[PDB]
Structures are given as structure tokens and as C-alpha cells.
């Protein structure tokens, strides 16, 4: 059985503080507690006595109602917390009943709060826990009677999302200590981070007890990831961020990733004790607690002589000042000195951060009992018969519906989840002096609100730290092409030409006929290449086409104007007229082998493709057959089959039909496939005028040309040896050679090449212009 510091008042608010240390394993089942805690224990038993002194002197809160207490000792352990909880209800359950405890200022572990909450929920005793900060204690199916003036670790989850988001960090690897604290907190953060548009690489479940090799190997998987990621969110504790840091030493990785942990190491300087220089640029956070000052004065006025309402003050002294008070009772005969008259608590005093919360909680109860009284004993002042015994379930009703203002001018506040607002301090560890390190603010969090006062944060070191799993290439031509891994870890790629980002992830190749607009934001009409003049280097083909027409217009001037020329009209006149027809049909179309392909103009164009060439050779075959028919028909080619007629107009009607045959073959091979182009674009770049040409319709007319030339030059093998004139027929076998060579040497530079149109123009214009130049331009001078 333990000690119990109590005030006899009217309504009694029980208390469980962490007076001692938890029993060490020696005596856990014996459940005897260690030494006093002095900063969690008796500091708080005095804060509570102080605050009941205030509330019993305050004329607003409970006038004509004394507010007693029964303080017990939880010891920061579940079994002792529960023995004590059972003692509170012991008297209430039945030299008689003294007073049912109205509420319990809830013991300061999460996991002895839970374990006491079970026992108190049985009895209708609302329990207000100033530092039970676990997630699971918002679920009021189980822990229905569980108020608290601290936020759940869901609000640290929110705050650390606020920091990593408020720096546009998105690829933060996650670590945590294992347990109800570290796993619950980190899991809530993790899912919140997922939906918000954050990411991770690993989720390390390191223990608070793990070996140096364990932190080493978790840090090693972190380290393999480190070329990408530079930020490590942590729900790690004191010794765990310590052990992770110890692995960082053993690797020589003192200042590399911006670790960003919860309040497991906000004002834990122990996590960096003799170690500081290796945790530079870590953005930790805590609870915003002010200090509380009238409590400081109450504490530092505590006369060990004048107190008669607090056991464990004596032990607070005898453990703080190591002196056995020889005359005083409960002397610690195990400490070696005697107490002088002049010691006082002014030395080494640290008012705890959880103290503002203890006094807020003792208020939230006193205002619960008040608000209940104002709404359930109306017209009467202090205890009425209703609220005697004071009900617990209805008290929980008012106690959760009672807003308030605290000690530090802040408002205590309860949701439907019986949890608090969550006011935070967002801190950093940085160069504060000559190489010196102390935990300092940048600013704060508040309910939903952030305050990064950025200027003080890490002097541009945390102002330059950045990590994302893929650096946004949200410009067109540059898709995001990933594996099926995770939403942050993609890869950027550049698009193909035909494509463009309509769908941002996937460049849409639009149809042929629309080519992708600059920046790959769409696609518009493609330019075209019809070829009228076609260039200045094609104005050269035009120069020779033009110039050939000038001289052949001059031949039609002075040749036919003469009318009488003995060499021209030596043989049949009809043969002479057929040659004239032949040559200028060979040279009417190459003056306009420039043409535009259109559906209407397709008869005009696709005609001049093969029928320019057809008539170009119809010229050459008229002259070839003139010389070969005069070889055959005269005694020059001697033969038994010399098919002549009686009236030489028949010997020239054969010629008319021997030209109409090639005419028919070419118009036939046209009207087998009616006129069109087929706009083959060999690429999304190259756009040119490319009409259909079945290579059949090249090799057939070509071959017909070459075969009629070679049969006539075969007959005219005997004029390549001797002319019987002014050298006509010899120069015409020279014409046959010089023209057939350029035709049958032109075939691979039209066939095996790329460009076709002007090359056919070259072939056929050259062939006719040189046929003229070699058979018809000499004669005009020889018969002057």
C-alpha cells in the first residue's frame, strides 16, 4: 500500500501522477516504485494542490463548493496505475463512504492511461489525460471517458505533412520506432501523406532496443536510396533517433539527409548529447506549451516545514539535496549528510513542458463540475441533491461541452473525439554561435495553421535541401514515362516527332495530315511541295526547255518558210511532214513538264508523266523508222521481204500507224489506272509531290523506246560507216547513239534514286533537244 496526498473538499478530483520511476524488472510483479521523478512527479502533485487552492479562492468557478483531491502515484507503470485506480473506486463502491471521485487527472503514459481508462469507464469516472498523446485514445467506443488537453499523434502527422508540403518536398523516406506511439502515429501520417500527394521509399520499423548493426542496415537501405532522396521523416524516439545517428557516425554521413522527426526528439537534447554536430539541419516539432509562472512562485516558496498536505515532499527534498533530515520523520537513513537550514529549490529548476497541460486539465475538470452545476442545479448555489452523489455520465456530457481559457491565456477545447486542438512549436538544430548547437524555434504550428518564419531556418541549408523522385518535366515533347511502381517515382522521356502531349503522360501521335505544333501542344496543317519553277537549279531545266523552244520556233520560221529545199524533199514529202510532227510532239510537252497535280488536272499532269516521254520517243521512232524504212525499201538493206507499196503515201500511212501504236500503248497504260497522286510522306518531315508510278509503267515505255531504236540502228549499221549525202544518215546513227545512251543511262538515276520528277524532265527534254540538235539543226544550214 502506497501514500495518498489528499484535500478534504466537497467534490473530489482524483489524480494519478508519475511520482516515482516504474518498477525495474527486479520487482515489477512486487510493484514497488523506484526514486522520485521531481520533474513529472512531485512538481505536478504541487501544481495540482496549487490549482485547487486557486479554484477554491476563485469566486466564479465553484462559489460555495470546496474542491478536494485524492492524489495517488501511477509510477509510470500499468500495474501500479491500476492498483491505485482500484483504490479510488474502493471507497466509492461501498468509518463509511467518504466521497466518490468525480474524475481522474489521467496518468502521463499513454499505455497506463489506456489501462486505467478501462477500469474507470466501468464506474463512470471521466479521466482527463494531460500527456496521453496516442492515436488509439480518440476511439471513444473503447475509451469513452477519456478527455485530454493534448492532441493525438494524428496532429503530429498533420504537422509533419505541413512541413514537408510547405517546402514542396514530396519524396520523403519514412522511419519510425515500433509501438502504439511510433507505428500508430507514422501509419496515420503515411496514409494522410499518400492522399495529400506525398511519397516514400522505405518504411523502417526500427526498435528502441535494436543493435548498432540494425540502425546501420536500415540506414544502409536509406543510403542506397540516398542519390534520389534527401529527406527522412521519422516518428522516432529519443534513443531511436540516437541509434540512427550512431549508425550515421559509423558511416561518416553526419549532415547529408534532412531528417525530420516528431516530438520524440524536439527538446530531447539527449538525442544529440556529445553528438550535436551530426544532427545539423533536422526539422523537429513539439507541443506548444507555454511555461506557467504563478506555479513557479508557489513551488519556490514551498517550505518543507509549513507543508502538511503532501507526502513525497520530504523525499523530493532528500533526493534533490541528498540530505537526511535527522529530526524530520521518514528520514532517509540511506543518504549521507544532514540537512542544513539553507537549501531551496531555486537551483537547477526546470518547470516541465507538460505542466501547462496539467493545470489546463485540472481546470477542464473544475469547469466541467461548474458547467454541470450551472445547467443541473439551477437557482441553487453549490451542491444540490441532484449532483449528490455527482453522476459521472452527465458530468462527461458537460465536461466535453465546456470550452474554457487555460492558465497561459490559451483555450482548452474538446472535439466529439474528446481530444484537444494541438498547438505546436516547430524547431531546428543549427549553427547558433561559434560551432555551437541548441534547440531553437523557427515559429509554430496552430490548429490547422502553420508558421514557418523561414529566415531563421538553417541559414539556407534547409532553404536548399530538396528531394523528389522525378524532377517535373511538365513541358511538351517531354512525357512522364514510368514503371508501374509508385506515383512519385516515374521517369521523364522525350517524345517522338509524330507525337505530342494531348494526354500529358502519353504524347498523342495525331493523324497524318496534321503535324505536331511547336512545343507539342497540338497539330496543324502540313506544307506541300508542288514544283512549278521548282528552284533556280530547276530554272536551269527551264532555261534549257525555254532555249530549245526558241531555236525550234526559229526552225519552224526559216525551215517551213523556205518551202523548197532539195535535200529535205529528195524522197516522199509526206515522210518529211511526219518527221516535223514527230519532233514538235516530242517537244510540246517538255516545255510544260512543269505542271500541277489536281483531280481535274490529273489528266493534264499524269498524261505529261508518260505521254511527254511517249511523244518524246515518238519523235525518235519517226526518224529511226524513216532511215530504217529507206534502208529496207531501197537497195541499201537488201532483203527478200522488203514490204513496199505502189503509192508511197501507203509507205507513210504505215509510219502514222507505227506512231499511233505507241500512242495507244501509253494512253492504255494510263486509263488502266485513272489519274491521281498518292501522297506517300516517307516521314512526318518530308512532304513532296509524289504521283503514283507502278514501275511497270516505267520499264515498259522505256523498253519500247530502246527496242525500236535498236531495231532501226540495227538496219542503220550501214550508215554509221558511210553516208551518200551531206552526211545526214551518219549523223543520224550518231543521233541514235548519243540519245539511246542518255535514255538507257538515265534509268538507274530514276529507278534506284529518290527524286524522280525533274529527272524524267532531264531524260526526255535532253533526248529530244539533242535529237533535234543532231538531225535537224545541221540540215537548215546545209540547204541554204
Amino acid at each position: 500500500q502506497r501514500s495518498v496526498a489528499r484535500m478534504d473538499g466537497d467534490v473530489i478530483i482524483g489524480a494519478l501522477f508519475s511520482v516515482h520511476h516504474q518498477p525495474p524488472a527486479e520487482k515489477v510483479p512486487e510493484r514497488k516504485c523506484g526514486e522520485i521523478r521531481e520533474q513529472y512527479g512531485i512538481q505536478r502533485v504541487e501544481a495540482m494542490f496549487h490549482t485547487l487552492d486557486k479554484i477554491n479562492a476563485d469566486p466564479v468557478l465553484l462559489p460555495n463548493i470546496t474542491l478536494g483531491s485524492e492524489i495517488r502515484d501511477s509510477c509510470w507503470h500499468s500495474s501500479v496505475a491500476l492498483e491505485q485506480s482500484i483504490e479510488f473506486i474502493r471507497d466509492s463502491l461501498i468509518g463509511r463512504t467518504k466521497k466518490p471521485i468525480a474524475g481522474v487527472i489521467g496518468p502521463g503514459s499513454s499505455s497506463v492511461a489506456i489501462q486505467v481508462q478501462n477500469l474507470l469507464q466501468l464506474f463512470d469516472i471521466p479521466q482527463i489525460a494531460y500527456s496521453a498523446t496516442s492515436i488509439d485514445l480518440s476511439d471513444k467506443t473503447l475509451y469513452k471517458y477519456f478527455l485530454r488537453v493534448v492532441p493525438s499523434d494524428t496532429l503530429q502527422a498533420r504537422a509533419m505533412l505541413d512541413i514537408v508540403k510547405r517546402y514542396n518536398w514530396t519524396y520523403v523516406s519514412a522511419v519510425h520506432t515500433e509501438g502504439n506511439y511510433g507505428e500508430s502515429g507514422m501509419d496515420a501520417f503515411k496514409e494522410l501523406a499518400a492522399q495529400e500527394g506525398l511519397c516514400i521509399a522505405h518504411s523502417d520499423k526500427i526498435y528502441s532496443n535494436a543493435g548498432e548493426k540494425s540502425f546501420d542496415r536500415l540506414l544502409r537501405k536509406l543510403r542506397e536510396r540516398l542519390p534520389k532522396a534527401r529527406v527522412v521523416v521519422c516518428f522516432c524516439e529519443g534513443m531511436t533517433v540516437r541509434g540512427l545517428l550512431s549508425a550515421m557516425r559509423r558511416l561518416g554521413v553526419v549532415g547529408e539527409f534532412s531528417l525530420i522527426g516528431s516530438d520524440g526528439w524536439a527538446d530531447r537534447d539527449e538525442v544529440i548529447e556529445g553528438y550535436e554536430v551530426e544532427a545539423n539541419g533536422g526539422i523537429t516539432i513539439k507541443l506548444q506549451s507555454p511555461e506557467v509562472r504563478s506555479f513557479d512562485d508557489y513551488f519556490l516558496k514551498l517550505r518543507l516545514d509549513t507543508n502538511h498536505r503532501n507526502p513525497w515532499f520530504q523525499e523530493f527534498w532528500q533526493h534533490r539535496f541528498q540530505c537526511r533530515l535527522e529530526g524530520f520523520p521518514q528520514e532517509n537513513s540511506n543518504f549521507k549528510r544532514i540537512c542544513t537550514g539553507n537549501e531551496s529549490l531555486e537551483e537547477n529548476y526546470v518547470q516541465d513542458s507538460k505542466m501547462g497541460f496539467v493545470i489546463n486539465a485540472i481546470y477542464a475538470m473544475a469547469h466541467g463540475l461548474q458547467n454541470m452545476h450551472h445547467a443541473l442545479c439551477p437557482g441553487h448555489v453549490g451542491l444540490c441533491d441532484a449532483m449528490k452523489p455527482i453522476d459521472g455520465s452527465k458530468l462527461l456530457d458537460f465536461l466535453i461541452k465546456s470550452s474554457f481559457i487555460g492558465v497561459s491565456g490559451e483555450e482548452v477545447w474538446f472535439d466529439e473525439k474528446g481530444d484537444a486542438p494541438g498547438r505546436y512549436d516547430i524547431m531546428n538544430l543549427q549553427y547558433t554561435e561559434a560551432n555551437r548547437y541548441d534547440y531553437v524555434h523557427v515559429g509554430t504550428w496552430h490548429e490547422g495553421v502553420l508558421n514557418i518564419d523561414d529566415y531563421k531556418i538553417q541559414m539556407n541549408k534547409s532553404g536548399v535541401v530538396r528531394s523528389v523522385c522525378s524532377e517535373p518535366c511538365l513541358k511538351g515533347q517531354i512525357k512522364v514515362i514510368r514503371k508501374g511502381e509508385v506515383s512519385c517515382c516515374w521517369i521523364c522521356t522525350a517524345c517522338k516527332e509524330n507525337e505530342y502531349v494531348q494526354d500529358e503522360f502519353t504524347c498523342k501521335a495525331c493523324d497524318l495530315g496534321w503535324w505536331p505544333n511547336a512545343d507539342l501542344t497540338g497539330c496543324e496543317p502540313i506544307p506541300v511541295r508542288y514544283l512549278e519553277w521548282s528552284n533556280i537549279e530547276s530554272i536551269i531545266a527551264i532555261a534549257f526547255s525555254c532555249l530549245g523552244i526558241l531555236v525550234t520556233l526559229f526552225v519552224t520560221l526559216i525551215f517551213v518558210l523556205y518551202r523548197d529545199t532539195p535535200v529535205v524533199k529528195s524522197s516522199s514529202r509526206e515522210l518529211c511532214y511526219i518527221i516535223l510532227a514527230g519532233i514538235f510532239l516530242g517537244y510540246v510537252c517538255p516545255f510544260t513538264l512543269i505542271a500541277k497535280p489536281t483531280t481535274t488536272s490529273c489528266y493534264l499532269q499524269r498524261l505529261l508523266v508518260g505521254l511527254s516521254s511517249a511523244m518524246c520517243y515518238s519523235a525518235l521512232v519517226t526518224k529511226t523508222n524513216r532511215i530504217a524504212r529507206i534502208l529496207a525499201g531501197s537497195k541499201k538493206k537488201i532483203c527478200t521481204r522488203k514490204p513496199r507499196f505502189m503509192s508511197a503515201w501507203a509507205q507513210v500511212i504505215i509510219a502514222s500507224i507505227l506512231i499511233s501504236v505507241q500512242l495507244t500503248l501509253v494512253v492504255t497504260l494510263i486509263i488502266m489506272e485513272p489519274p491521281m497522286p498518292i501522297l506517300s510522306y516517307p516521314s512526318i518531315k518530308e512532304v513532296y509531290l509524289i504521283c503514283n508510278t507502278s514501275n511497270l509503267g516505267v520499264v515498259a515505255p522505256l523498253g519500247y523506246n530502246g527496242l525500236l531504236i535498236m531495231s532501226c540502228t540495227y538496219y542503220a549499221f550501214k550508215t554509221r560507216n558511210v553516208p551518200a549525202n551531206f552526211n545526214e544518215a551518219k549523223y543520224i546513227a550518231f543521233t541514235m547513239y548519243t540519245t539511246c545512251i542518255i535514255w538507257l543511262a538515265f534509268v538507274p538515276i530514276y529507278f534506284g534514286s529518290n527524286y524522280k520528277i525533274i529527272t524524267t524532265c532531264f531524260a526526255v527534254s535532253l533526248s529530244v533537244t539533242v535529237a533535234l540538235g543532231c538531225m535537224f539543226t545541221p540540215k537548215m544550214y546545209i540547204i541554204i
Partner: nanobody
């Protein structure tokens, strides 16, 4: 709260060493410190015997220091004394009183009292 009981007083001689067994109720008892006040008829109350909570160091009135011993059991919820070298006048009502807080001995604010025994003493 504490409820006491005092035994061991009785008719002994001048030189007769006698027990004083102050048994108790309450379970907190090892938190308290015991003392035995001495008030025989015709002479008012003076604190003569005392003992801290833990056992630890303890206290006897100098007048009888070395003429007694004090013992305690946190175990059995009960304190003990012994008189040595008894005298006719060493008798008194032995108010085993019990103080949790206090000052320097013997001014402890003795909270919970026992009946105590006017130990009948002869030679």
C-alpha cells in the same frame, strides 16, 4: 484512516525489562512515524520515545536513552518498544501516537493516536 491498539504495558519491577507492542490498522502504516508519549497521572504529557517511517534512525528521550529499545515492522503493520532498567516513575500513559509530517523531533504533529496504556509499575 489509521486505527491503533496498544499492548505490552503491565505490572513489572524496578529493573524489569518489558515489551510495548503498538499494533495498527490502515495499510499506509509504513508511511507514518511512531512515537510513545509519556503521561502518568499527576505529570503531564512529554514525548519520550519515537521512530521514523523507514525504521532508519530513531529517537529516545536522553533521560532514558540507553534504557530502552525501539523496533518496527512495516510487515505486520505494528511497532514495538522495550523498557530496560525500569523504575516506579518510568510508568506513564504510553500514547503510541503517529505522525506522517512534522518538524525536528519531538515536534511532529502526531496525527493518528492510539488508546495508550497507563502501564501499572511497581518495584
Amino acid at each position: 484512516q489509521v486505527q491503533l491498539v496498544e499492548s505490552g504495558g503491565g505490572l513489572v519491577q524496578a529493573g524489569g525489562s518489558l515489551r510495548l507492542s503498538c499494533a495498527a490498522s490502515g495499510r499506509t502504516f509504513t508511511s507514518y512515524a511512531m512515537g510513545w508519549f509519556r503521561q502518568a497521572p499527576g505529570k503531564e504529557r512529554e514525548s519520550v520515545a519515537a521512530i521514523s517511517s523507514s525504521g532508519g534512525s530513531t529517537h529516545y528521550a536522553d533521560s532514558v536513552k540507553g534504557r530502552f529499545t525501539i523496533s518496527r515492522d512495516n510487515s505486520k503493520n505494528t511497532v514495538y518498544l522495550q523498557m530496560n532498567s525500569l523504575k516506579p516513575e518510568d510508568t506513564a500513559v504510553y500514547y503510541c501516537a503517529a505522525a506522517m509530517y512534522g518538524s525536528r523531533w519531538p515536534d511532529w504533529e502526531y496525527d493518528y493516536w492510539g488508546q495508550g496504556t497507563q502501564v501499572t509499575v511497581s518495584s
